Paper text:
Binding modes were described by cryo-EM, resulting in 8 high-resolution models of SfLptDE in complex with Bicycle molecules at 4 different binding sites. To confirm the SPR competition binning, four additional cryo-EM data sets using different Bicycle molecules were collected from competition bin 1, which had the most unique sequences. The resulting models showed that all four Bicycle molecules bind in the same region and with very similar binding mode as Compound 1, indicating that the SPR-based competition binning can effectively be used to sort molecules according to different binding locations. All five imaged molecules (Compounds 1–5) in this epitope had an aligned sequence contacting the β-barrel of SfLptD, with a ubiquitous W×(D/EE) motif making a consistent interaction. In each of these interactions, the Bicycle molecule tryptophan indicated was docked into a hydrophobic pocket formed by Pro483, Phe485, Tyr516, and Pro518 on LptD, with further stabilization coming from hydrogen bonds formed by the guanidinium group of Arg520 and the hydroxyl group of Tyr516 contacting both the amino acid backbone and the side chain functional groups of the D/EE residues. The remaining residues of the five Bicycle molecules aligned poorly, especially in the regions facing the detergent micelle. Compounds 1, 2, and 5 were subject to an alanine-substitution experiment – residues highlighted in green could be substituted with an alanine with little to no effect on binding affinity to SfLptDEFL, residues in yellow resulted in a marked decrease in affinity and residues labeled in red were not tolerant to substitution, completely losing any binding to SfLptDE. Mutation of the key residues in the W×D/EE motif resulted in significant aberration in peptide binding to SfLptDE; substitution of the tryptophan residue with an alanine abolishes binding in SPR while substituting the aspartic/glutamic acid residues with an alanine significantly weakens peptide affinity to LptDE. However, mutation of the hydrophobic residues in the peptide loop facing the detergent micelle also abolished binding for Compound 1, indicating that the micelle plays a significant role in the stabilization of Bicycle peptide binding to SfLptDE.
LPS biogenesis systems are essential in most Gram-negative bacteria, with LptDE responsible for the delivery of LPS to the outer leaflet of the OM. The outer-membrane associated β-barrel is made up of 26 antiparallel β-strands (β1−β26). These β-strands are connected by turns on the periplasmic side and extended loops on the extracellular face that fold over the lumen of the barrel and require rearrangement to allow LPS molecules to reach the external surface. LptE is tightly bound in the LptD β-barrel.
Residue numbers in the entry:
A (entry chain C): 1 to 17
B (entry chain A): 225 to 381, 386 to 759, 766 to 784
C (entry chain B): 1000 to 1149
């Protein structure tokens, strides 16, 4: 699990490690 | 009105001599019943078959109940079993009531996995690997639908079931220039084994799209949002045996962006056929879905989808919702059509490919490719249809994957058909061993009966004689093993008041693990009906039934 | 001698039409309505008082799932799905012209992931209707020429 950072829009479209 | 039909006989290698003594009972309009004693000599008993056909406001339905109280052959092969009785229950219901209610039932349940290899194949087949048991009740109006269904499977060769599954679709078309829709699902996954994980999944998917069109071009932009919640239990046994651990609570949130575009060009086929028109249609589609690590979610209902030409532009790599592969790709294809002077399409040919800018990942990538290709043009597909004349037609398709380093699959067919009674057809199916290894379980790749793939040539023919005789033949042959797969002959004589048909079939009917060879079944039977020449019925009687390809 | 398509996929005499079927809330009706709205066709109810509007009546569809190929043990390897749809375009003054669509799809069988295969089958059916709808639209001009020939 994890919690989204402040920049929800940019963080939504990024890939995962 | 109600009485005895003509008894019919058969000789098979499974039950030797078989006798049928049907009795028809017209209970009322929309209610027929058929009670058939079926004496089997090798099993030395009588199977009682009970068919019930009904029509009601909820729709049309058919139930079948076959019961054999004891079986000598099954007793000999299973001497430690408590009882040797066999049975089969089948129920097929389909109906739409008041244009809004939809009732569907497709239920099959047999007593043992070897039922369809030993008994007649009326509502089942020996080619079946499992029996389906599906119930569904839905409410559908013009902008809304909500369905609740149950899906269970009886495997013949552990299975997951949705108990229950709820799907909801809502649409709204005129929100400014945008079309909008929302999809929702709630499913409970249960396994037959008591040590496998159980799941509850809730999924939401709002989609918006802007379409634009001309006389020649079209472009659709689509933004979709996927939010899934998993609650998983019974993870102790799985987690104690796997290095990758399943999670009890999982949230998967991901957007999807898609752009599709089509163009149409026209030209006049002046040199070949004046009045004929040729259309060239290029189509492109960019798809982006960010990568989400889904290794902590068990795969319940996601399977890899075949990628034909139409499947190249699909936005999903797997079915279901347990696995959603990341995408950064562009699909490009072209379709050429040829229409005659009457604006009737005589020819079409499509070729397309998918180019991957990044590897498609789900976090759990266990599929065995033949090479480590990850990006570039990896998937190619092609299709073709040609109506050569009013009686001649040819269809074909091919799917190539560079990761297999082979042609994945292919199929072809050429058919002549003067009418329902006079026809010839040649067909070919191919699936490579690499595709079988990649898309199927490991023991498929290691087993003799599975590992070689498919290379099958089929020929079907049907010819009337004297406007009262009909002769039908079929032969399906495997080029890899150089062995017959299926063969069928059938001759029917039709009169004004009656018809008599005699049929013969030899088919693959199983595998012998001891000497490691296929088992064959031969069946020759006669049938008399009280009065077409029955060509189409005979063509649909074997394990590889005929289908019209124009 | 290639050029962009200067005409419309739907003929100008069919730009306003009546969509009629025995299952107006079914998947085929929804797919056909979406396809007709794609090419800017104005759909009317069957009880409208506007005359000289061609009517597209959707017949009953049939979906068959047969075994295309088998393994060495006689088990099903590939399933072939065939969707057949019949319809009639009635131009009120002139005549009623029948049309049909046939769609072929294939998929491999997997008992071990049978439930997943069932989901895949549903997806395939949800594609097939769309293809059938497209085929119906592609038979629209051939009717129109048949209206002009007679
Ligand atoms: C009409 C329907 C409504 C449509 C509304 C528009 C929705 C789409 C919003 C823009 C996002 C889609 O655009 C998509 O953006 C992502 C941002 O991660 C780009 O993706 C790229 O972004 C950055 C680059 O530094 C990386 O984090 C990422 O790994 C990379 O793939 C995709 O290449 C692009 O295709
Ligand atoms: C682009 C539009 C047109 C595309 C559609 C064309 C029709 C489909 C192809 C049908 C041709 C016959 O089917 C074809 O059979 C041969 C073998 O018999 C396959 O060939 C495959 O197996 C043979 C085995 O002998 C290997 O030697 C070969 O390297 C391998 O590719 C082809 O991969 C398959 O496509
Ligand atoms: C498209 C039109 C053409 C198709 C129509 C014609 C249908 C007939 C196809 C030819 C095959 C049928 O012929 C098949 O031959 C095999 C040869 O292994 C024999 O099969 C079996 O028969 C007996 C009983 O087990 C044994 O003696 C034999 O060794 C064994 O192979 C049978 O004679 C029949 O099963
Ligand atoms: C915590 C989490 O599961 N996500 C947010 C973390 N971020 C981010 O950019 C803020 C990126 C990775 N991500 C993954 O799934 C690996 C997205 C979900």
């Amino acid at each position: 699990a994890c919690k989204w950072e402040n920049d929800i829009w940019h963080c939504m479209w990024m890939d995962c490690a | 009105r109600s009485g005895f039909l003509i008894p019919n006989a058969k000789y098979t290698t499974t039950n030797y001599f078989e006798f049928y003594l049907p009795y028809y009972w017209n209970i009322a309009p929309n209610m027929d019943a058929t009670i058939t004693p079926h004496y089997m000599h090798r099993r030395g008993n009588i199977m009682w078959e009970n068919e019930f056909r009904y029509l009601s406001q909820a729709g049309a339905g058919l139930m079948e109940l076959d019961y054999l109280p004891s079986d000598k052959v099954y007793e000999d092969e299973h001497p430690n079993d408590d009882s040797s009785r066999r049975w089969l229950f089948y129920w097929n219901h389909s109906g739409v009531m008041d244009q809004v209610w939809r009732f569907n039932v497709d239920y099959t349940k047999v007593s043992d996995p070897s039922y369809f290899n030993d008994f007649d194949n009326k509502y089942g087949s020996s080619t079946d690997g499992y029996a389906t048991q599906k119930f569904s009740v839905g409410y559908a109006v013009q902008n809304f639908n909500a369905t609740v269904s149950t899906k269970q499977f009886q495997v013949f060769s552990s299975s997951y079931s949705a108990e229950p599954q709820l799907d909801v679709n809502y649409y709204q078309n005129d929100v400014g220039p945008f079309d909008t829709r929302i999809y929702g699902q709630a499913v409970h996954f249960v396994n037959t084994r008591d040590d496998m994980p159980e799941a509850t999944r809730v999924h939401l998917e709002p989609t918006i799209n802007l379409p634009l069109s001309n006389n020649w071009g079209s472009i659709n932009t689509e933004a979709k949002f996927l939010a899934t919640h998993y609650q998983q239990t019974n993870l102790d046994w799985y987690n104690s045996r796997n290095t990758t651990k399943l999670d009890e609570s999982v949230n998967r949130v991901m957007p999807q962006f898609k752009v599709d575009g089509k163009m149409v060009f026209e030209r006049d086929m002046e040199m070949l056929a004046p009045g004929y028109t040729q259309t060239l249609e290029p189509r492109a589609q960019y798809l982006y879905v960010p990568y989400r690590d889904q290794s902590d979610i068990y795969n319940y209902d996601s399977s890899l989808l075949q990628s034909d030409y139409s499947g190249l532009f699909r936005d999903r790599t797997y079915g279901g919702l347990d696995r959603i592969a990341s995408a950064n790709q562009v699909t490009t294809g072209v379709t050429s059509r040829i229409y005659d002077d009457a604006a009737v399409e005589r020819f079409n040919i499509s070729v397309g490919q998918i180019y991957y800018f990044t590897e498609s990942r789900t976090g759990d990538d266990n599929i065995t490719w033949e090479n480590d290709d990850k990006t570039g043009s990896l998937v190619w597909a092609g299709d073709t249809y040609w109506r050569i004349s009013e009686r001649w037609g040819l269809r074909g398709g091919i799917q190539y994957d560079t990761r297999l380093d082979n042609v994945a699959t292919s199929n072809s067919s050429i058919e002549y058909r003067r009418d329902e009674d006079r026809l010839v057809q040649l067909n070919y199916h191919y699936a490579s061993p690499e595709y079988i290894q990649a898309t199927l379980p490991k023991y498929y790749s290691t087993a003799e009966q599975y590992k070689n793939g498919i290379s099958q040539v089929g020929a079907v023919a049907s010819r009337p004689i004297a406007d009262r005789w009909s002769i039908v033949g079929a032969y399906y042959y495997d080029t890899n093993a150089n062995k017959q797969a299926d063969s069928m002959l059938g001759v029917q004589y039709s009169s004004c008041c009656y018809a008599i048909r005699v049929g013969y079939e030899r088919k693959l009917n199983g595998w012998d693990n001891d000497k490691q060879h296929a088992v064959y079944d031969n069946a020759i039977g006669f049938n008399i009906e009280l009065r077409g020449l029955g060509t189409q019925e005979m063509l649909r009687s074997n394990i590889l039934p005929y289908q019209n390809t124009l | 001698g290639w050029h962009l398509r200067d005409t419309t996929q739907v003929p100008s005499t069919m730009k306003v039409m009546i969509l009629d079927s025995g299952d107006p809330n079914g998947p085929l009706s929804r797919a056909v309505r979406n396809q007709l709205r794609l090419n800017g066709v104005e759909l009317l109810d069957k009880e409208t008082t506007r005359k000289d509007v061609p009517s597209l009546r959707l017949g009953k569809v049939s979906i068959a799932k047969d075994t295309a190929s088998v393994f060495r043990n006689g088990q099903t390897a590939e399933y072939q799905m065939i969707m057949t749809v019949n319809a009639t375009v009635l131009i009120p003054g002139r005549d009623i012209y029948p049309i049909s669509a046939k769609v072929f799809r294939s998929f491999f069988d997997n008992p071990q992931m049978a439930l997943a295969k069932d989901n895949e089958q549903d997806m395939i059916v949800k594609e097939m209707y769309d293809r059938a709808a497209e085929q119906l639209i592609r038979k629209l001009p051939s009717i129109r020429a048949a209206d002009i020939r007679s």
